[PDB]
Amino acid sequence: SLLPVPYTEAASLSTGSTVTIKGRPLACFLNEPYLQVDFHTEMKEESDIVFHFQVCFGRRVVMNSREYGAWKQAVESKNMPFQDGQEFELSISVLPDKYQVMVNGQSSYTFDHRIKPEAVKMVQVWRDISLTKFNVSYLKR
Amino acid sequence: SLLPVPYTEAASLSTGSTVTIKGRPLACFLNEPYLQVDFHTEMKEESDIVFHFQVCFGRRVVMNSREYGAWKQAVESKNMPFQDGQEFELSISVLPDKYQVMVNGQSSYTFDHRIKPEAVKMVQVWRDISLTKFNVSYLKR
Numbered sequence: 001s002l003l004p005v006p007y008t009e010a011a012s013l014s015t016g017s018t019v020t021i022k023g024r025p026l027a028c029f030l031n032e033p034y035l036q037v038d039f040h041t042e043m044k045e046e047s048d049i050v051f052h053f054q055v056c057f058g059r060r061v062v063m064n065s066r067e068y069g070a071w072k073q074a075v076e077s078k079n080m081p082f083q084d085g086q087e088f089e090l091s092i093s094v095l096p097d098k099y100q101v102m103v104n105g106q107s108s109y110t111f112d113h114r115i116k117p118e119a120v121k122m123v124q125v126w127r128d129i130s131l132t133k134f135n136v137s138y139l140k141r
Numbered sequence: 142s143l144l145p146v147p148y149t150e151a152a153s154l155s156t157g158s159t160v161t162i163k164g165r166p167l168a169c170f171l172n173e174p175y176l177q178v179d180f181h182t183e184m185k186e187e188s189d190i191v192f193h194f195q196v197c198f199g200r201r202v203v204m205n206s207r208e209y210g211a212w213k214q215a216v217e218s219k220n221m222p223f224q225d226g227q228e229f230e231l232s233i234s235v236l237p238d239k240y241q242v243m244v245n246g247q248s249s250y251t252f253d254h255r256i257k258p259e260a261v262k263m264v265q266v267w268r269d270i271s272l273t274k275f276n277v278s279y280l281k282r
Contacts, residue, residue, distance in 0.1 A: 030187050
């Protein structure tokens with residue numbers, strides 16, 4: 001809807017940063033829409049991915065990194081706090097040792113840093129969602 | 142781009158009908174964009190699917206049907222005529238015994254009818270593409 005999807009924003013991340021995303025899946029869960037959030041090391045979409053977060057709504061979540069062109073060890077989760085047909089609020093916080101992903105205010109996934117978050121230059125949000133809000137916080141030293 | 146995605150059109154199919162789709166993937170193949178074409182038995186997206194065609198660009202194609210709410214036996218193919226970064230023309234012809242899928246003029250997949258094509262009432266084209274052309278032919282008795 002309001003924001004264009006695929007959505008790309010230049011970004012910088014460090015401990016204490018938060019990425020906030022508000023959106024809605026474009027299809028009922030029976031049709032298995034996806035959502036993907038990628039933290040890139042360059043503005044180019046083929047660049048490395050420090051944190052890859054892919055939701056198959058109603059089924060599974062996969063997290064990984066792409067380093068020097070190659071996907072590393074996938075982390076797969078069956079935790080599914082997203083609700084069929086509902087708007088969601090997704091929050092990704094940079095902690096000292098990991099990303100923490102909150103879904104509608106509830107801690108739902110974490111992912112230990114494989115690359116320093118300082119390597120991030122770009123965030124992309126895409127696949128089968130509409131987006132009404134995207135924010136990266138920049139309040140900390 | 143020009144046509145809205147997800148794209149839905151009421152449709153009727155019988156022997157000799159052709160569905161023509163011209164589009165472009167929204168991402169390079171390294172990021173694994175998808176394309177999905179579904180022939181539905183009702184205008185509602187939760188309705189049964191007589192022919193489901195899902196491309197994971199650069200990797201695989203899965204075809205199936207959803208009958209009374211349940212996915213049946215998947216047909217998986219590694220044939221990949223789609224070209225990274227390129228516009229594609231996709232043609233799906235209804236033959237007496239099967240669907241035949243042409244990609245840029247080349248026969249690439251077929252799928253034997255599990256449900257009569259006359260059961261189709263709607264076609265949906267969605268996932269990670271832009272669409273510039275969609276047509277269903279209606280020339281035959």
